[PDB]
Amino acid sequence: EGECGGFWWKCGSGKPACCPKYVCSPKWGLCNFPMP
DSSP: OOOOBOSSEEOSTTOOOBOSSOEEOSSSSEEEOSOO
């Protein structure tokens, strides 16, 4: 059920939004932290 964006969740054209903590990288279509 839960398909939130974790440390590495495929995002882009046809995907869900990342969690409040994770975000979709501009270079790579994956949900991860904003920065180490």
